[PDB]
Write a protein that binds this DNA or RNA. Structure first.
Ligand SMILES: Nc1ncnc2c1ncn2[C@@H]1O[C@H](COP(=O)(O)OP(=O)(O)O)[C@@H](O)[C@H]1O
Ligand SMILES: Nc1ncnc2c1ncn2[C@@H]1O[C@H](COP(=O)(O)OP(=O)(O)O)[C@@H](O)[C@H]1O
Lengths: 239, 185, 239
DNA sequence: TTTTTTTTTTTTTTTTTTTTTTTTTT
């Protein structure tokens, strides 16, 4: 009824001019489809990694309180602030494949979570996973996992070990639970021994910590540049 | 496309794929419903003698194929169908993609990956074939899945090649499977 | 149409000279085929045994912190170190068909996992199965196994029994749990009763440990040369 | 006969850690 030019012309009756069909042949169309497919695959994988964190846990790795939490806003007051801040910077930069833990010890209100979240904000741009979490919330996850037979705590610990940068928060408290001890040592065991990093946040001293944190745990924490940064300062929000 | 709500880049890519498909004149679609293997062989032998020799056949939802002789017994109907299609493929020396549905046996199984058994009728199709490859897309069954946008092609029989479980990406907004250069399987 | 001569000539047209078949006969064919059959079956059963615990679980064997763990990076300090290294070597050399266990004891930072992993590194290349593991990880696997009915704690325990050298780590902590004790003693019961070796790693003394590993299990471990080898040094990473 | 899909009723087989408040008597 109608031929090549006539059909394409009946179709240019719709589309305006200066139309570069962009392929003209098959040898190129397959290649373009290949390219776009690899791109969409990468994006899809990113999205599903994110969803895996949202399903295994709740609470997207950084919270909306420490979300706008880069290095820049960290107001400077003293020299230890540089000893912490620039050390954090080189810790981020030298993080790649580095077995380098860290413990920020210090009083509350000092910006421990703040710099530990600046780290994580950077590593999100790097393309890695993160999680700031409280041990209370971890044990809550455990004890909720006990309920349902769809997820299990070994699956949970594997989800934790599969994380790139895990950090723990509110550890200095002397909760005496055997079942907290067996988890808090096992996690860092499964991470360090699996050749992955981790870094805690505390309010305590080394020996204050070392009876709660077993000798093995401190041993598997102290590697390379173990980063024993400490805050011996006055709280921020009282200013 | 079925709304006309499209932009210049899209108008262009349509023009391109069109102006490609017109130049070759490969494809030949039959929009007839209740065919028989007789008619399939006839049409295929017709496109064969004129246009060189064919290179591929696709048959959507095989079970609609008929042969009124065996309309009283359905299993034998499908058996005749399968033998006819194999003989066709052996005659013209091409492949014959022949889709087929599955039965609702894999629903009461908790795995939902189809096995070679779960074919819609007669079980000859699990015998007359050189290749079966089912499809499985977990996001249909599991909304709790971290495996979405991902459709895997569960091979289930191959007489001259390996079994497997291939993995691909589904984007049904434009009705395509694409390659999944991702982790292993 | 064609004979041996013409056909094999057209065959050499494909493939060049000096391709001599090394069979020439009907019996050597089947003989070498059976030879390769058994050789293939060896690595086949090897792959089965080694993929059990990488399919169900991860990292079955030595884990990436203690992988690069030759005997020779072992730093020398004292006669205790000489005793440890030398006795480890002779334990490896007299390993085959020898019911001999090991219970290292002492503080961390001394080379328990180090020496166990050097041992297991060698017994890999000797052709034996190994698994360093935490008791917490075993129990985590158990508590996950209760979920699925396809697998079973029976299956995992028989798998551990199938291991040549099962070893245990961080057993010193005093968890009194019933379901932990049944596993920790049942495993040794199954292995030793089936004429199979193993060995443990702890911190405490024989008596303080023996309420955790029952008198039964301890005496059933102390066969041949029990190899109690003890470390009473300072931590390595303190240096 | 033998295949196949569909619904409906019967039996049988399979199951751990957690956290608390007690509240004694020294
Ligand atoms: N040097 C600083 N500059 C800017 N904000 C700070 C500083 N130190 C503390 N803060 C603020 O104080 C809050 C508490 O610090 P954070 O580390 O989150 O808690 P904690 O001090 O208990 O670890 C943060 O929300 C942060 O905004
Ligand atoms: N004799 C040694 N020479 C060199 N390094 C050692 C020695 N003993 C222990 N180490 C090191 O100390 C760390 C702890 O040793 P290991 O036995 O693996 O754990 P643990 O000391 O807790 O048993 C390891 O990183 C190991 O390399």
């Amino acid at each position: 009824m109608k031929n090549v030019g006539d059909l394409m012309q009946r179709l240019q009756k719709m589309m305006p001019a200066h139309i570069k069909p962009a392929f003209k042949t098959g040898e190129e169309l397959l290649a373009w489809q290949k390219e776009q497919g690899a791109i969409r695959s990468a994006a899809l994988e990113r999205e599903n990694r994110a969803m895996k964190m949202q399903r295994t846990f709740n609470r997207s790795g950084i919270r909306p309180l420490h979300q706008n939490c880069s290095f820049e806003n960290y107001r400077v007051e003293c020299e230890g602030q540089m000893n912490a801040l620039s050390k954090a910077r080189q810790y981020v930069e030298e993080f790649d494949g580095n077995i380098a833990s860290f413990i920020f010890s210090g009083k509350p209100g000092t910006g421990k979570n703040h710099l530990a979240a600046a780290i994580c904000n950077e590593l999100l741009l790097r393309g890695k996973s993160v999680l700031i979490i409280t041990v209370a919330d971890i044990m809550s996850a455990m004890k909720d996992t006990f309920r349902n037979s769809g997820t299990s705590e070994e699956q949970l610990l594997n989800d934790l070990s599969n994380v790139d940068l895990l950090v723990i928060d509110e550890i200095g408290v002397q909760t005496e639970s055997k079942y907290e001890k067996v988890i808090i040592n096992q996690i860092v065991d499964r991470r360090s021994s699996s050749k992955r990093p981790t870094g805690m946040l505390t309010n305590s001293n080394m020996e204050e910590m070392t009876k709660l944190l077993g000798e093995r745990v401190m041993d598997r924490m102290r590697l390379g540049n173990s980063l024993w940064v400490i805050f011996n300062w006055d709280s921020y929000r009282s200013r | 496309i079925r709304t006309g709500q499209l932009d210049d880049e899209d108008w262009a890519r349509i023009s391109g794929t069109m102006g490609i498909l017109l130049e070759k004149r490969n494809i030949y679609i039959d929009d007839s419903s209740g065919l028989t293997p007789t008619e399939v062989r006839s049409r295929a032998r017709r496109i064969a003698r004129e246009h060189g020799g064919i290179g591929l056949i696709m048959i959507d939802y095989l079970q609609l194929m008929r042969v009124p002789a065996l309309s009283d017994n359905r299993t034998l109907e499908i058996a005749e169908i399968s033998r006819s299609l194999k003989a066709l493929a052996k005659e013209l020396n091409v492949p014959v993609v022949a889709l087929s549905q599955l039965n609702r046996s894999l629903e009461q199984r908790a795995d939902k990956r189809p096995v070679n058994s779960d074919l819609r009728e007669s079980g000859s199709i699990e015998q007359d074939a050189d290749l079966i490859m089912f499809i499985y897309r977990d996001e249909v069954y599991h909304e709790n899945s971290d495996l979405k946008g991902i459709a895997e092609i569960i091979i289930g029989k191959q007489r001259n090649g390996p079994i497997g479980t291939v993995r691909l990406t589904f984007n049904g907004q434009w009705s395509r499977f694409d390659n999944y250069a991702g982790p292993q399987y």
